[PDB]
RNA sequence: UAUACAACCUACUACCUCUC
RNA sequence: UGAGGUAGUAGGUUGUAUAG
RNA sequence: CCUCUCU
RNA sequence: UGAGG
């Protein structure tokens, strides 16, 4: 190991053993200063142990002349609580190596997709699984919005005290049917209702009533009655185009089948 | 039989033709194979007997992948031309361009046309004209107009017709087959050329049996739902929408939209809901991809359709709530009557037993139905469990995911197969026990292809028609059926399909009718690949050939020519008698064969094929003669050996009155001084040395390094002898006393059975003290000598005697050896300095204060030592002398009273321990001038000035890399588990690899998995497929010039050539040449081993390949093998009488050693020698025992009577004793001059032998060696020195084979003065239009030898830093098949190639195509593919064995190896440099150094765990090494596969 | 699920002392 | 060679505190 | 007159 | 432009 290295170099030469100094650090992370005779180097992670297997690395190199500081595991399940998608399984799978400095790899698996992390200790390995997983499943306010509309988690520790399948892609569809039971029955007495003199009065108390602002905006088109585009600010990403006169019974007519 | 391939390449060779098979991937070799025959003349300019070819295809797509396929498969320049290339805007001049570049010329039908009608190419020019889709002549299209150019023209020059047809008649056109099918003959002037329906092949028009059809009737059932309703009107108003939108386009959307509406009418809402999901995915997709916002606006707004349709379609589902019941309720009735039939017909039945095929008319309808159904099963409990749904269509990840889907379907894992309707190709499926076309059939080529997969006469072929069109369709049906019968009808002809006995001079038969199984059974004994045997080929000679070959004669009979294939002897046509029947003019061409054959040979008495055995039987007297005085014969363990010193070693032993000579042992420290070292540099380096006294004069002996505990030093001894001669017996008796004194006392050497030896009969000389006595010269020290007879013993003190005498004096402990008679029992020490200031008193130098000395000393022993007498004199400092013997694998201020003082110099001391170190290296070194001189001798070098009597030795060399690992104080010596699932596997094909994703890196099927997929899935497949995760004017032959991952002469080549670069053989070589491994030195054999193993191939290849010029290379390597194994080298070397004179034990001379000048009591070893009754009994117990001492040990020699009784007694009560092992040779072997050398030390050491002599003289000096050896008995007429020039062995003719040999040359980087050499060296056994020479075999036997030999030099000069085990991996790496085909493939001589074998064809297409993908590169992924030897095979032996024919061949027309070095060097230069950064290990070291997988080997079955998963894969080999390897390659294909 | 501190146990590594 | 000690590494356990 | 193909 | 409808 790092330590071990630094540590047996000391004994060989002869010199004085190396002192380490942990401090609290920038955010959740301690910073790791090793003190070496006549040298001295800087190593930060987020585990005391982690900064310390990194300082070692760093004055390591200078004598022969990245730790994230976050639970990143938990980070991930987060993640995937708030985008609807199976939850993450890691695991260590496989341990081979010396028992003084051994090598650990560990699967994470979000429903099909896996990747692999590997490292000297089970947590570390852990994490380094569930980063890279991440960082492939990537590639604030609105998840308030999102909360008022539909009972939603957008944690794991909440999520894990009620006890998610994730929304498959053939089950998307019911969006506007799962949302607050108090929102839609106000939102159909609001369509079956004609007391509105206008179509356009109507279309926006049902889109209000949802808490969905539209965004009406011009597309170009080859046509004398204008053809508009009524873009919607929520996860399903609705898309609607039609004639002016159209547009506004379409946003009713969406709404109503959709909220059945 | 041949081919169905090959007999149709042939039938079109002479005539034109149709060629017609259904089943597909045939043709194009069959297209390839008519080319390739047709091309005699491609290369001639056009204008001189120039011939060209064509190729028109009716599309573009299809006219360049043949274009493509005809580029990756043939070594002839080809040229696309179609219309995206302007070819209308052409002129006479640039196409007269283009015909002269090109030699194949790949089209469409249009292009050509307008081209031989503009004159601008005639049809006599071309060769051949290959029409693929031939079946679209009728009419007025450009085909048919190309064929009326040929009713205008010479008429005596028109070139050969192709028509390679997969459906003979156009769709849905079946009025009058059999006057369409004339008209296509008419029209392309060949008869339809078909292969009968058979194993090989099956023809679907020419089967009988037919299954039993079903017609099922659905209702109309015309109940229209107002959902679907609701869904259209949705759909046109987003129509509406989308043609006004101003913009990955608006008719890909179009189409995705009325293809969902197609599957909501005919299959139902439960279908329709499957199918909206399809679109979902595919309109997501698109979004992504899309540049401009425009476009994702529109693919956007399609998408929100269609979830918008996805939801209507599930509520009309829940409304009646993926159950049995919603999926019957809403759908077709269709779909309800095949999901009724399905029950009914595979109700409960074993899942092996049903294999089923529904065929569906759209592609997109597959996918919707295999939802449909895999639902439905999952719903019925009674058909779950009993069918499991696959679909197929008749982009990498589609196509391998396809391919996946029909292997499941083959191996039987799924039941039922979901196709596409068949259209233009068949599809590649079992016969399936029952067949049910669930979409109306629109083709005749449908209908007999479906009904055509429906084989078995039991199965029942089931069609579901609307009750409207049953009428219709009964008819349709009907007349493909009369129609189907009527092209069979006209295709049933035009399928492809006395003599005196010699009685041998031994009473023998010979019938003729045998003959052609005898010619059959030769055929298979000669070498032979996997892919097949070569039978001979038979062809009736045409009426006008007979003309030639025969006159009168041949008229009114015929005659059949025999061509055996070109491996065998008789490689000329064997024309047979002329006979009225062809069936018997067969019994005489094979007869005739036989008979010729007899002559040669190649048959036994009885007309039996000759066996290997027999063919080495015949050999054996000639060259294996020695092997039968051994007790051993060539036809159907370790082994003792006696030890004979060296002749100057042999009665040395010096006498009185007469000269003798001492050679002075000086010791020079190479190491500074530093307090640590400072003793030993001053000690070593003192004028008084010691002497190797002998009456036989020494040989200039090298200088030898020894590695002290302090560094390293260089033993030399003297040059010149120093001669005193010896005036009586009494100074005799003091030099042997004397030497007795220095083993016994000094070195703790004296055993209790070892009696001085005065006997001057073996390893008989002293070793004397020399002091400067004299000015000049170094007197002997008989001073010395008096009076240390016997080192004193350490009788110790009395307290009092302690007292009294006056012990100590500074002067007498100046540089004598001490040892302290308490604690440390005779540990002896040298007293380096003598302190006066410090006295017992004094305070402790020593950091650690405790005062006076004499404190410490009383404190450690008060009991042991009297508190010290004399509390006032100097404190002497000691240094310990260590107790190792065995010197090659790299302060304490005592008090002088309490100290026993030997008075020996102590300058000796030290160089006296090194004694038996230099003395085991004098006595091998001696054994290595001797074999150097007798070498040099036989080679008549001995003259030379170098190597003459003014010849000096080399210092001797330090191999730098030997591990020689130590155990303590010098002697050298001779994890975590967690659990796992357990597994098994299938063998992972060439194409898995070509990919460059790990397995669990993979996407899934969004496609096969609609329902379970999560929107996280579908991110990772459009990333993965962007790979965000993981050509008309170049050549075919044009290599990439950039790294792939003036050559500096040979020496070896330079020594052989001129006589001045010889420098002269070295002791210091031959002393390595004879030292083993086990002998734990510093030097060893194993790299002249590799040196030497690569030249004796070599030169037995070119022995045998002189001597036997017309044999097969399986005699030859077989021979080769018998010449070159470590038997035949271990009765050469022990009958050239070397192996007595080996370095083969490790040295430790306190238990192994017998020391020069004593032995074992003349009494015993005599017993020993003359009663061999008594030797075995004779064990190390009985002779400790012995303890025989004072005079019977010095004075007399013989051990007494009472002793000698005992002895005799003691070992014969062994007999009855827990001492019965007798396997006591190994303990008491060192006692009477054996050793044990295992057989593979013995060969070894023959060829590191010979590497002394290749490396230092050169190849011709060699080769003389081997007669010496009696390896290769050399005739009178042919001297073994000239091996390397002796004969190892129209143009119009050869160059018709070879056409752009201009390239191969180019990219070979050698141009051929004689191209017959590279003609035998492209052909192959199959190919049988080579009559001009003869294979490849017979120059790839030579090529392999020049190839490793000339490797094997340049690793052995320019890699000395490896230890001789990594250039044994290097070495086999470098030479491995796998490394030469992916050369060959590299440099573009695969094209070039000349073989008729349609697997070999195929698996090298493979092979090209992995390499390409890799980057024509040797990585892990293609040593771990299986290869011929591994013994089907992804890796053809064929590409590396041109390889080296190639090799050979560029040898035998240059006759210089130094041009071939310069050849071999240009090809391999990227493989040598990689390799030697990173040297390849053995599949064993690396699937047993593998970190995570622990392998556990049994047809050995290798169980391994890899990632979780513990799978024991099998392999299967002839030899249990063989199957243990494919077990290992079979294991490592799988761990990367699922690696981490 | 991470983190910090203290204890126990197991496997191993470097060095030192004593002894042989 | 055996014994003992010091510093580290990795696993497991226990208890406390903290965040989530 | 339309589909596919071709130029 | 050729084939089919």
Not at chain 1, 208 to 236: D, G, M, R, Y
Not at chain 2, 490 to 511: M, Q, S
Not at chain 2, 775 to 801: A, I, Y
Not at chain 2, 1166 to 1178: Q, S
């Amino acid at each position: 190991s790092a330590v071990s290295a630094l540590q047996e170099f000391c004994a060989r030469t002869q010199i004085n053993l190396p002192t380490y100094s942990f401090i609290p650090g920038e955010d959740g992370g301690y910073v790791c200063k090793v003190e070496l005779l006549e040298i001295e180097a800087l190593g930060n992670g987020r585990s005391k142990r982690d900064a310390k297997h990194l300082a070692a690395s760093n004055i390591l190199r200078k004598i022969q002349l990245t730790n994230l500081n976050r639970d990143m595991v938990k980070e991930l399940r987060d993640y995937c609580v708030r985008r609807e998608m199976p939850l993450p399984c890691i695991e260590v799978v496989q341990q081979s190596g010396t028992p003084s400095a051994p090598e650990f790899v560990a699967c994470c698996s979000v429903a099909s997709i896996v990747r692999y992390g590997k490292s000297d200790k089970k947590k570390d390995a852990r994490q380094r699984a569930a980063i890279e997983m991440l960082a492939l499943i990537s590639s604030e306010s609105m998840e308030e919005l999102e909360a008022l509309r539909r009972k939603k988690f957008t944690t794991y520790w909440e999520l894990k005290e009620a006890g998610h399948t994730g929304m498959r892609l053939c089950d998307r569809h019911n969006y506007f049917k799962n949302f607050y039971p108090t929102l839609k029955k106000e939102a159909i007495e609001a369509i079956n209702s004609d007391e509105y003199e206008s179509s356009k009065d109507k279309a926006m108390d049902v889109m209000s009533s949802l808490k969905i602002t539209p965004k009406i905006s011009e597309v170009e088109s080859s046509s004398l009655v204008p053809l508009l585009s009524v873009e919607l600010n929520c996860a399903f990403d609705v898309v609607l185009m039609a004639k002016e006169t159209d547009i506004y019974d379409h946003i009713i007519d969406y709404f109503r089948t959709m909220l059945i | 039989p041949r081919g169905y391939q090959l007999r149709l390449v042939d039938h079109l060779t002479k005539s034109n033709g149709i060629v017609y098979l259904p089943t597909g991937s045939g043709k194009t070799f069959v297209a390839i194979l008519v080319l390739k025959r047709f091309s005699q003349d491609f290369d001639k300019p056009i204008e001189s007997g120039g011939k060209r070819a064509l190729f028109m295809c009716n599309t573009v797509e299809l006219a360049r992948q043949q274009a493509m396929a005809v580029r990756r498969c043939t070594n002839f320049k080809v040229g696309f031309y179609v219309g995206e290339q302007g070819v209308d805007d052409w002129t006479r001049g640039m196409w007269s361009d283009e015909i002269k570049k090109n030699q194949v010329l790949v089209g469409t039908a249009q292009v050509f046309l307008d081209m031989v009608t503009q004159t601008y190419v005639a049809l006599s020019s071309l060769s051949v004209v290959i029409i693929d889709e031939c079946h679209h002549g009728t009419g007025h299209h450009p085909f048919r107009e190309f064929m009326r150019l040929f009713t205008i023209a010479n008429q005596t020059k028109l070139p050969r017709v192709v028509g390679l047809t997969g459906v003979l008649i156009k769709g849905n056109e079946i009025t009058n087959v059999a006057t369409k099918l004339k008209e296509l003959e008419i029209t392309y002037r060949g008869n339809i050329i078909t292969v009968s329906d058979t194993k090989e092949l099956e023809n679907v028009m020419l089967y009988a049996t037919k299954p039993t059809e079903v017609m099922v009737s659905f209702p109309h059932q015309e109940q229209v739902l107002t959902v679907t309703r609701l869904i259209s009107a949705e759909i046109e108003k987003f129509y509406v929408s989308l043609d006004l939108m101003n913009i990955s386009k608006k008719s890909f959307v179009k189409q995705l939209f009325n293809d969902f509406l197609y599957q909501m009418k005919e299959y139902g809402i439960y279908a329709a809901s499957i199918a909206i999901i399809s679109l979902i995915v595919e309109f997501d997709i698109k979004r992504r991809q899309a540049e401009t916002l425009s476009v994702k606006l529109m693919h956007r707004t399609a998408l929100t359709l269609c979830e918008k349709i996805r939801h209507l379609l599930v509520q009309k589902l829940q409304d009646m709530t993926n159950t049995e019941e919603v999926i019957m309720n809403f759908s077709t009735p269709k779909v309800q009557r095949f999901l009724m039939s399905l029950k009914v017909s595979f109700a409960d039945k074993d899942p092996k037993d049903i294999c089923c095929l529904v065929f569906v008319e759209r592609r997109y309808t597959c996918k919707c139905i295999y939802g449909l159904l895999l639902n439905y099963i999952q719903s019925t409990p009674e058909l779950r469990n009993v069918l499991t749904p696959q679909f197929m269509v008749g982009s990498v990840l589609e196509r391998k995911w396809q391919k996946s889907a029909i292997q499941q379907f083959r191996d039987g894992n799924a039941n039922l197969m979901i196709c596409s309707s068949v259209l233009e190709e068949g599809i590649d499926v079992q016969a399936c026990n029952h067949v049910f076309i669930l979409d109306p059939v629109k083709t005749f080529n449908m209908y007999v292809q479906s009904k055509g997969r429906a084989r078995t006469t039991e199965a029942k072929f089931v069609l579901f028609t609307a009750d409207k069109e049953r009428e219709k369709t009964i008819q349709q049906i009907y007349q493909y059926r009369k129609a189907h019968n009527d092209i069979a009808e006209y295709l049933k002809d035009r399928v492809l399909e006395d003599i005196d006995p010699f009685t041998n001079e031994n009473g023998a038969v010979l019938l003729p009718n045998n003959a052609l199984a005898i010619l059959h059974r030769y055929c298979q004994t000669i070498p032979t690949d996997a892919f097949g045997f070569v039978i001979p080929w038979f062809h009736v000679l045409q009426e006008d050939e007979r003309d030639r070959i025969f006159g009168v004669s041949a008229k009114g009979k015929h005659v059949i020519s025999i061509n055996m294939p070109v491996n065998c002897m008789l490689r000329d046509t064997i024309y047979s008698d002329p006979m009225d029947n062809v069936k018997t003019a067969k019994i005489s061409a094979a007869f005739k064969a036989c008979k010729v054959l007899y002559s040669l040979g190649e048959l036994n008495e009885r007309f039996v094929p000759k066996t290997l055995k027999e063919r080495v039987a015949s050999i054996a007297d000639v060259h294996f003669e020695h092997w039968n005085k051994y007790g051993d014969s060539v036809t159907a363990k370790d082994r003792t050996y006696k030890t004979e010193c060296p002749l100057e070693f042999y009665d040395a032993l010096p006498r009185v009155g007469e000269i003798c000579y001492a050679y002075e042992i000086f010791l020079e420290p190479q190491f500074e001084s530093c307090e640590y070292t400072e003793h030993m540099y001053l000690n070593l380096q003192t004028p008084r040395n010691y002497a190797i006294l002998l009456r036989n004069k020494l040989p200039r002996l090298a200088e030898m390094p020894l590695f002290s505990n302090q560094g390293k030093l260089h033993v030399r001894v003297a040059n010149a002898p120093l001669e005193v001669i010896i005036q009586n017996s009494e100074q005799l008796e003091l030099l042997h006393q004397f030497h007795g004194m220095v083993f016994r006392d000094i070195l703790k050497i004296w055993h209790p059975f070892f009696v001085l030896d005065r006997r001057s009969k073996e390893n008989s000389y002293l070793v004397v003290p020399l002091i400067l006595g004299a000015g000049e010269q170094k007197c002997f020290d008989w001073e010395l000598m008096t009076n240390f007879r016997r080192l004193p013993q350490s009788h110790g003190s009395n307290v009092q005697q302690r007292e009294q005498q006056p012990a100590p004096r500074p002067e007498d402990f100046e540089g004598k050896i001490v040892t302290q008679w308490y604690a440390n029992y005779d540990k002896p020490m040298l007293v380096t300095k003598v302190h006066r200031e410090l006295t017992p008193l004094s305070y402790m130098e020593k950091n650690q204060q405790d005062k006076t000395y004499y404190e410490f000393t009383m404190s450690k022993y008060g009991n042991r030592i009297g508190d010290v007498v004399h509390k006032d004199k100097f404190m002497i400092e000691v240094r310990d002398l260590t107790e190792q013997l065995t010197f090659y694998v790299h302060k304490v201020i005592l008090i002088p009273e309490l100290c026993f003082n030997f008075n020996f110099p102590g300058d000796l001391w030290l160089k006296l321990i090194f004694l038996p170190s230099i003395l085991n290296r004098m006595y091998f070194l001696l054994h290595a001038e001797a074999l150097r001189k007798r070498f040099n001798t036989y080679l008549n070098l001995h003259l030379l000035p170098f190597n003459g009597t003014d010849y000096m030795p080399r210092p001797l060399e330090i191999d730098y890399s030997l591990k020689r690992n130590v155990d303590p104080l010098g002697n050298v010596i001779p994890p975590m588990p967690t659990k796992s699932i357990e597994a098994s596997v299938a063998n992972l094909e060439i194409t898995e690899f070509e990919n460059p994703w790990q397995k669990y890196m993979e996407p899934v099927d969004l496609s096969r998995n609609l329902l379970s997929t999560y929107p996280v899935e579908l991110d990772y497949y459009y990333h993965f497929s962007v790979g965000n995760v993981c050509y008309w004017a170049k050549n075919q032959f044009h290599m990439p010039t950039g790294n792939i991952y003036k050559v500096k002469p040979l020496l070896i080549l330079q020594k052989t050539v001129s006589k001045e670069h010889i420098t002269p053989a070295e002791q210091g070589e031959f002393l390595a040449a004879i030292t083993a491994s086990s002998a734990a030195d510093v030097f060893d054999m194993e790299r002249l081993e590799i040196l030497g193993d690569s030249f004796l191939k070599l030169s037995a290849t070119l022995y045998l390949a002189s001597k036997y010029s017309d044999w097969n290379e399986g005699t030859l390597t077989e021979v080769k093998s018998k010449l070159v194994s470590n038997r035949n080298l271990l009765f050469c070397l022990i009958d050239a009488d070397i192996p007595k004179t080996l370095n083969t034990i490790q040295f430790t001379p306190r238990y192994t050693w017998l020391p020069p000048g004593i032995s074992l009591p003349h009494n015993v070893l005599a017993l020993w020698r003359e009663n061999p009754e008594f030797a075995k009994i004779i064990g190390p117990h009985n002779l400790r025992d012995l303890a025989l001492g004072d005079e019977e040990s010095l004075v007399k020699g013989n051990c007494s009577d009472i002793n000698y009784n005992r002895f005799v007694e003691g070992c014969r009560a062994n007999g009855q004793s827990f001492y019965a092992g007798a396997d006591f040779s190994s303990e008491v072997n060192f006692c009477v001059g054996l050793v044990t050398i295992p057989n593979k030390v013995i060969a070894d050491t023959l060829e590191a032998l010979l590497g002394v002599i290749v490396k230092n003289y050169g190849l011709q000096h060699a080769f003389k060696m081997l007669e010496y050896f009696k390896i290769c008995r050399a005739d009178i007429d042919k001297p073994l020195t000239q091996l390397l020039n002796l004969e190892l062995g129209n143009t119009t003719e050869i160059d018709g084979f070879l056409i752009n040999h201009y390239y191969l040359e180019k990219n070979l980087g050698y141009t051929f003065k004689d191209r017959r050499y590279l003609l035998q060296a492209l052909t192959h056994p199959s190919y049988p239009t080579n009559r001009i020479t003869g294979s490849y075999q017979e120059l790839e036997f030579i090529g392999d030898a020049i190839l490793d030999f000339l490797i094997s030099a340049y690793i052995f000069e320019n890699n000395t830093k490896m230890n001789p085990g990594a250039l044994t991996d290097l070495r086999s790496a470098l030479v491995n098949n796998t490394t030469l085909a992916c050369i060959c493939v590299r440099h573009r001589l695969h094209f070039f190639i000349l073989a008729e074998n349609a697997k070999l064809s195929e698996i090298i297409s493979k092979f090209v195509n992995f390499q390409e993908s890799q980057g024509h590169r040797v990585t892990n992924y293609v040593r771990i593919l299986l290869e011929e030897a591994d013994v089907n095979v992804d890796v053809p032996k064929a590409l590396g064995d041109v390889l080296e024919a190639l090799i050979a061949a560029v040898y035998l027309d240059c006759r210089d190896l130094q041009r071939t070095w310069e050849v071999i060097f240009n090809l391999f230069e990227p493989e040598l440099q990689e390799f030697t950064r990173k040297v390849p290990i053995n599949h064993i070291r690396q699937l047993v150094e593998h970190k995570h997988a622990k392998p556990v080997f049994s047809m050995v079955s290798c169980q391994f765990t890899c990632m979780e998963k513990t799978i024991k894969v099998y392999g299967f080999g002839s030899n249990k090494d063989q199957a243990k390897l494919s077990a290992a390659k079979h294991a490592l294909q799988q761990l990367s596969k699922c690696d981490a």
